[PDB]
Amino acid sequence: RSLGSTCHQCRQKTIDTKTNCRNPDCWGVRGQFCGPCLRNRYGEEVRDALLDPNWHCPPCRGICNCSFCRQRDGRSATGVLVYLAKYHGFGNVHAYLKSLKQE
Amino acid sequence: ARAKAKTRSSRAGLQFPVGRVHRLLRKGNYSERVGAGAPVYLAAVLEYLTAEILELAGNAARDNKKTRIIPRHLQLAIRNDEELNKLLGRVTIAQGGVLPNIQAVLLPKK
Amino acid sequence: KTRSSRAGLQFPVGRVHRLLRKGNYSERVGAGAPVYLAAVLEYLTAEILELAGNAARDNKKTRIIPRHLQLAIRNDEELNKLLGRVTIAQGGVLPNIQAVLLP
Amino acid sequence: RKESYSVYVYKVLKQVHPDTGISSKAMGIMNSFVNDIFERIAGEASRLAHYNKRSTITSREIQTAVRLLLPGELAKHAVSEGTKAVTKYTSA
Amino acid sequence: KRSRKESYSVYVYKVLKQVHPDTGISSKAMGIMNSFVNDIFERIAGEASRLAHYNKRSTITSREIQTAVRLLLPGELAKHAVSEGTKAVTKYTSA
Amino acid sequence: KVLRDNIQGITKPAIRRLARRGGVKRISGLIYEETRGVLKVFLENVIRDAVTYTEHAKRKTVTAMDVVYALKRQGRTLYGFG
Amino acid sequence: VLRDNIQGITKPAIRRLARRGGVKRISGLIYEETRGVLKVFLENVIRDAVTYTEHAKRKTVTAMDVVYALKRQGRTLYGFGG
Amino acid sequence: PHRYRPGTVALREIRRYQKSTELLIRKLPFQRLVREIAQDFKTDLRFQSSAVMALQEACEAYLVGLFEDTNLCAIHAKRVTIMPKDIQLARRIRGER
Amino acid sequence: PHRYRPGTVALREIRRYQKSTELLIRKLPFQRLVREIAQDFKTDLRFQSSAVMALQEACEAYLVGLFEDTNLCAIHAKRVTIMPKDIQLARRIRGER
DNA sequence: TCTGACACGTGCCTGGAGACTAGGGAGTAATCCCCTTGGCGGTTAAAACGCGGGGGACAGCGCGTACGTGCGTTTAAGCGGTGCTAGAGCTGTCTACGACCAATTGAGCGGCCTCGCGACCGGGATTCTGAT
DNA sequence: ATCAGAATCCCGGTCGCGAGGCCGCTCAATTGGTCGTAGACAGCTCTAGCACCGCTTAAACGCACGTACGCGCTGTCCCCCGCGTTTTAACCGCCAAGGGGATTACTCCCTAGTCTCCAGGCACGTGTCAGA
Ligand SMILES: [Zn+2]
Ligand SMILES: [Zn+2]
Ligand SMILES: [Zn+2]
């Protein structure tokens, strides 16, 4: 309860390595994401995100779909969308979300 | 020189406030005067009783794998210790529920 | 010129004021507080004494003893309720036998 | 030396029963009853004075304590027998 | 314009961090331990006042507090609680 | 504003649930009215004392503390609302 | 030293207490249960009477100490100087 | 069709409701009952939500305790079902007249 | 010879002892029991006579009340004799257990 | 008849009463906002009915245990004396202790805001009973 | 006894409101000094617990005997439980008013507090009468 890191998307406490935001203008812990959330949301992994020097947290690029950020955008809550994207052939919900906007 | 003031609870080595307890005793019209060792004793006793109830309630919550005590974890911590149960035998606890207890007569036969 | 005479009571009022001040119930005691308290005490004592005297008269006795007081309290419903958890020395008990016990 | 409610309870007894005396043991029982009731009512009046942030015990506290302890007809009667004294004190 | 009221939540919480360093307490349970403290305080203080009045004393002292704790608290509690208070008092003597 | 026939709102399933928490397994069909009467008497006493406290406070509202004091006067100290 | 004095509460004494209570038949095992109950009650009262006596640094247990000890348990006793 | 033997769901309900903590009486009927009772003593009264909640909590606790005593009285008489006479005996012994 | 049927003398003493008001336990055995019990709290105690008398009055009143409740429990279970289970039930319901 | 427990009689203080005072507790106007009172529409879960039948309350019967009643034996509770002394009351002295009071300073209370916990569903074991 | 309806954890997905902390004041706890008296300690006295001795003699105590009643066994209706169907009012989310709990600013008069004097209960002491 005093040691674990909390992911931005899932907002739970667990023992796992989490990525960091390299944006100098980035503030707070919102640059930290856990593998199970980001791999299900955008197709990125912990290793590549850690190794990339210019990698930014999904809030930094503006592609964060967390409920807090989703509400900051003035639009509704996503909920669970992985299986909907899978039924539509989309590997990640972000491509599904981008396709939904296009349609 | 008036050296830096230290709370009387620190001199007593306590966590409950001896000074506030002194004020409560004096303003609660219990007696015309109150000594210097009355607030210390009363504060220590209240601290100890709270410590025991919290000891029991933390375990009662841990066996429920919860990280935030609720009223329930007090009742299970009270009605299971015989002495604490005796001390608080005429007290109801809001949202406290009751211990699971089914009489052996009602249990299914065979 | 005593305080009881002004209020027209036979119970003391100055003594009740002294017992209110010396018993640290409050810092200040009002003017009519001892008067009201003495009147209520006088009324309750008068009711108890009337009931006990009637019980003694029905007992063909001249002096009131603890048995008469116990009978008077235990027969009057309101006085019994007011004194539900009090034991009277040599007061005895109300004679009562359950119906199933009888032949 | 020692004080009691012997004289006052004897006066009340003579008022309510001109031809009835009282025994010493029963007299002590009456003393204990008067002390117990006085303690109860004074303590309850103190509690009401504390609850409402009042530093003075007045007739209102005694009246509400009487209404709180005394059951049923004993309350409404006693209140009527209490205020009747206080208003008399007002007349002096 | 504040209506600030005293409550033992500053201590009821702070003594919980000395007995269960990684366990919380709900605000519905802080308002129960608050009442427990405010009830036991009144019990012991009232008993101490009665004890002082019986002996024609006007000063509530640690003897009346000790006797009140001995009268109310049952069993090992009264044997343990006292052993706490005495320590505090004797520590108070050393200042 | 006035109300009438509200003790029947203490339903038979609700009384059965209160009995189930009490550990009883079988319920006679005649205990529902008995429990309604008992609850009404208990509520009458506590509410009378609470409204007495409210009247002494010169208040037109009944607060939690009045109820807590009314219960404490009957030896039913309640923790959680004080 | 004194011992086994609880047997001094004889069977006919318990019989008289039960008859005053209003019971007409008594089982044979009632007497031991009553002796145990009475011993527990006596210990509970005497503990507090001796505590009250010790608080006053006295070697004599007065009647008023017993009266206070009984009052502590909600068993107010009249007629002994209370 | 599957049909539980009588009494099975009784123990199931006993376990379920002894595990929980929520109030068993619906809030609106109890609020109406409280208002109806209090209207006699004083008129045009007002209740804090905390007042009604505290009254309800006290009533449920009292009823649960009374039901435990009633169940003990029932088991004493070599019975399993609680009857009104058990409630009466429990209330008489407890001193609640 | 003349022989009363069982239970007649029972009612006779029931009426006789609810009519009377004196103490039913002998003074000396109760005083000895009080002294032995108090021996375990403070050594070499002394007792005022009124103290022992008050203790006897309180103990007798307590036992008479307990026997009243026990008789009620026994009558509830369709019995006339009082058994230890009735005393246990009365003490449990009263809050003593 | 006789037992004394209770009914007054009378000194005698010693707590109560009368005058006067000053200071602080508490009515009273004067807002203010907040948190109690309503309407109002769905809707969903929860109360209400109905019905079959199974387990349980209730009465009866019979045999045997255990308790009440009585009688003769015993034995210690109760009563009355008689010294004896521990210790409970009472008083006097005076000292340590707590109240009252002016600075003054930090501990705790209110608001804030964000982080972690305690919730919801959604498929898969995992028990849990019932009849065979 | 094994298999199948049925209820229930269980562990993955999310989300959402509250609970730890954190900063700013402000109210009260702390320091220090002065002063009055409450309780502690030392003698003195008288009371009333406590220990013993005898002596009746009611009350406890063993045994005997009979029978009342507690207790297990059968029946036998019948009342409550479980489940399916329907329906209906609680619950939730909104808005909409305004009544009154709460908080200052007087300011007035109620009550400790002091002093002086005096008569109402208390204790010692009998004496007629309940009543054991
Ligand atoms: Zn995550
Ligand atoms: Zn970032
Ligand atoms: Zn985000």
Residue numbers in the entry:
A (entry chain K): 264 to 366
B (entry chain C): 10 to 119
C (entry chain G): 15 to 117
D (entry chain H): 30 to 121
E (entry chain D): 27 to 121
F (entry chain F): 20 to 101
G (entry chain B): 21 to 102
H (entry chain E), I (entry chain A): 38 to 134
What does the paper say about this structure?
Mutations of the SNF2 family ATPase HELLS and its activator CDCA7 cause immunodeficiency, centromeric instability, and facial anomalies syndrome, characterized by DNA hypomethylation at heterochromatin. We here identify the unique zinc-finger domain of CDCA7 as an evolutionarily conserved hemimethylation-sensing zinc finger (HMZF) domain. Although DDM1 can remodel the nucleosome on its own, we have previously demonstrated that HELLS alone is inactive and must bind CDCA7 to form the CDCA7-HELLS ICF–related nucleosome remodeling complex (CHIRRC), which exerts DNA-dependent ATPase and nucleosome remodeling activities. We propose that the CDCA7-HELLS nucleosome remodeling complex assists the maintenance of DNA methylation on chromatin by sensing hemimethylated CpG that is otherwise inaccessible to UHRF1 and DNMT1.
To address this question by biochemical and structural approaches, we generated the recombinant HMZF domain of human CDCA7 (hCDCA7264–371 C339S). Formation of the nucleosome-hCDCA7264–371 C339S complex was readily detected by EMSA for mononucleosomes where the structural model predicted successful binding (Nuc-58W; Nuc-58C). 3D classification generated a cryo-EM map of 3.0-Å resolution for the NCP, and local refinement and local classification generated a ~4.0-Å resolution map for the extra cryo-EM density located at the hemimethylated CpG, which aligns well with the AF2-predicted structure of the HMZF domain of hCDCA7264–371. This higher-resolution structure confirms that CDCA7 contacts the hemimethylated CpG at the major groove without eliciting any drastic distortions of the nucleosomal DNA. The R274 side chain forms a van der Waals interaction with the methyl group of the 5mC (-58W), while it also establishes a Hoogsteen-like pairing with the adjacent guanine (G; -57W) of the CpG dyad. R274 thus confers preferential binding of CDCA7 to a hemimethylated versus unmethylated CpG. Meanwhile, the side chain of Q275 is located within hydrogen bond distance of the cytosine (C; 57C) and guanine (G; 58C) of the unmethylated CpG dyad on the complementary strand. If this cytosine were to be methylated to form a symmetrically methylated CpG, it would sterically clash with the side chain of Q275 and consequently push R274 and destabilize its interaction with the original 5-methyl CpG. Although not all hemimethylated CpGs on the NCP are readily accessible by CDCA7, particularly in the context of strong nucleosome positioning sequences such as Widom 601, we anticipate that most native DNA sequences are flexible enough to shift the CpG into accessible positions. Residues Q275 and R274, the latter of which is mutated in patients with ICF3, are key to the hemimethylation selectivity of CDCA7, while ICF-associated residue R304 is important to mediate contact with the DNA backbone.
